[PDB]
């Protein structure tokens with residue numbers, strides 16, 4: 001969603 005943290009979420 002826009003937090004830019006690698007390792008959690010879709011992959012951004």
Ligand SMILES: CC(C)=CCC/C(C)=C/COP(=O)(O)OP(=O)(O)O
Pocket residue numbers: 001002003004005006008009010011012
């Ligand atoms: C207790 C939990 C599950 C906390 C999750 C917080 C977090 C760093 C999410 C990543 O968001 P992101 O914007 O990097 O996600 P995406 O890769 O989908 O964009």
Ligand code: NA
Pocket residue numbers: 004005006007008009010011012
């Ligand atoms: Na992420």
Ligand SMILES: [Zn+2]
Pocket residue numbers: 001002003004009012
């Ligand atoms: Zn995100």
